[PDB]
Symmetry: D3
Subunit: 158 residues, 6 copies
Amino acid sequence: MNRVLYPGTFDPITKGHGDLIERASRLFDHVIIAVAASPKKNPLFSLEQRVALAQEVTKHLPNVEVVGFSTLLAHFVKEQKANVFLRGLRAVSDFEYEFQLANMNRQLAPDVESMFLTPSEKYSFISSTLVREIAALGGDISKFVHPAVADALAERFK
Amino acid sequence: MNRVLYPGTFDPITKGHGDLIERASRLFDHVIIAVAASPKKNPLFSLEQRVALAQEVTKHLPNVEVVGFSTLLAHFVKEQKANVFLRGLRAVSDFEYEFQLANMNRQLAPDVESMFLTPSEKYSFISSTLVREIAALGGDISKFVHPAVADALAERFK
Amino acid sequence: MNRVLYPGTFDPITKGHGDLIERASRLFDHVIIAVAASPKKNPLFSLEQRVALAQEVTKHLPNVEVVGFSTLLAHFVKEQKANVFLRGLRAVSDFEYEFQLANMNRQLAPDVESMFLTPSEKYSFISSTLVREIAALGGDISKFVHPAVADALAERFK
Amino acid sequence: MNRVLYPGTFDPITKGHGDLIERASRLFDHVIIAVAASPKKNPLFSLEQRVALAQEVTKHLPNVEVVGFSTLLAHFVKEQKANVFLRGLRAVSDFEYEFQLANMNRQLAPDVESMFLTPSEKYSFISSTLVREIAALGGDISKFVHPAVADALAERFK
Amino acid sequence: MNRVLYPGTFDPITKGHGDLIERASRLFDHVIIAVAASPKKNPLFSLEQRVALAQEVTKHLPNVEVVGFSTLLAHFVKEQKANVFLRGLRAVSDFEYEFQLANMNRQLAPDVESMFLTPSEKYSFISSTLVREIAALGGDISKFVHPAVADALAERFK
Amino acid sequence: MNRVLYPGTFDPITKGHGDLIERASRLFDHVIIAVAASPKKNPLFSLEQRVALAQEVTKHLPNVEVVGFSTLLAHFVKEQKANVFLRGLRAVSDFEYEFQLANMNRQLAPDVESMFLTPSEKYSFISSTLVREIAALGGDISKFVHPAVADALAERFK
């Protein structure tokens, strides 16, 4: 079978990410949401809290587990025994940066293939960075993230 | 009537912004230059001086108003009773970020329309970030910005 | 006043065009849909039927007029006394062609301003070319175009 | 089950396609190379000959089948009972057409998921159109296509 | 010394192309304007007439010669004993197609390096295709091409 | 004369840069690798150490000199009496920043021409930022950078 690994910051996890997991859960027999620590980017939520948010959003999917890791992505995919990388591609991404990451990871872990999916047309154009800025200014983010994610973001700025 | 709101950092305001304001004043009955504080990017000039610079550059246009705001753009455009967003289109810039911002602003303020303009070929490829870097190294920036902006930047790095 | 001219082939007119006309009617006092003949690309529908389709789709909007023209766009916009060009912005499309066309039109008609709009996320990624190809193979195109356009395309390939 | 369908013109099939089929064969239990007729593009090789070329290039893979079709891709994928669309992304593809095709196919066949793969850096930047132009001028195309394709192209233009 | 080869259709040659030749003539000791026949694209002007136009535009440059060729570009650069390919890069080009051409030509002629230049900001966004369409509709093309090129285009449509 | 100036951060220098310097050495009589200080980017290696790394990678080329500078690029190129700017384009670069930098540098130093080269397909998609992130996590970066750079990065994060 195929065990897909979905790595990302997930700070926070949005409906664009969630729609990708919904499509990935129907496709693969096992989906691993690999929440990366990434302490150099200064995430708003901690690695511990980001894992709990991704679990609440994906608690309805049986073959989906969320794990936090602070090691190299190329080494962690071997430790998780996953053979497929998963990244999202919408009309608002990093087409340049996404190819360098997929190509350089193919040199570190040639057994792991990097495939890309596209979210729904309604949940594209939704970035986690703009979600935090709107949440920091008291904006309504019910359209971009799960209701549980909106609770953490609302509580984070009080 | 049409009351357009042109939001941005304007740190500093350049001839690309000025040409965009010149075209916006000819089209709409009232142009509001909404200078955002944006403390997370560490602006070179303060919000007060960026408003004063945009007023000096646009003092010859009667239907142009400059205001500084530090709140959410979706809330501030409603308080100004503006129904049109204005954003600039050059080379490629962040074609992704411009689409995600316009779409996410359409979810917070669906009544406010996001339109885009393109400056003249003479004032394209002029970014506010590169103006500060050349000014920090003592370079001649009289060609890229208004004479008043060149004075403030010269006073900033001497 | 503001009299916007929306030029294009409209072969056929899609929901992406329709959403753009809906937003243009709310903003400007008069919208002119300038349907171009464009015989070099070999359009599927004639200029007469493309005008009739755009009139049927926009018959509910009072400030919208549909006209067919086979002359230069720069000459026709002057004859219609329009001062604003209107073009659509989706995914990426021909970001190059849109800039060269807007700039070269600014050399032929500098008094006519070229502004760009973006349709809703629901009607983006909808091209007139792919609508004809799916219609030619008997596909269901009720989701992409107006019901009247689906009738003409169905009559075209049966 | 996972039965992937790889549609394309394959006129002719190149080493960029071949590396994509080899990576798709490692992931899925069955790979279907769906060679489209596309008579409107005026293909260099016929639909029958394009299928025979793709069979020779992929004759070493047991779980790979090549079929030719001249109907709608959404109807043919339903007839093949395939649940995965496959398209290639080499950072020099048609991100515009690829996103419009995947999204509009999601309206015709929502049960079929559109995923994208990336070939190796050595086999990227290889387009079937430029292979025909170099072959038409007597150029050496042994590096871009399979040896069997090089024989057909050499026989085609000599 | 360096003998640069500037290949292209030049149908017709524009001021964007001319500005590239002006910069190339100051840089290299010898500039060869290689006008390609390209009969499959159906050029407006013949290969014989396109050579005469490029000679009239560049008659003021001593180290610039215009030649017409109907063979492979990779073979013709060896026959011309040129070691540098030259292509233009503006904010309106074919960033995808330009890399495939430069990379695949590096496999056919590894001794010939493909370098890229950028024209002036005023002469960017000027394509030969839009020049012919505007000329075919009686438009004023004095801004895009040399006065001699405007004479041929005006005489061509009478 | 032709004295090319190759500016960049080189933090660290990669194989994509190295292939670009080897191709630049074949063309010009003298290649100057201008390592910029750039203290605002917080480089991993110091300006002195980045110059020493570029010297070891290019020690086999006689006509290549590496110098460090902390002034404006337009002022330093005048002090070096160089007439050619050199930047790399691998279809995954920063076409936005690269065009804005080349055009605005043409206002500061019009006598200095900005040309672009493309590295091999094997050494494209290699960014200095991703090399540091993989090295910081103990990853194998022997394939992306020179062996001397691999020793420094291994000593830097071990």
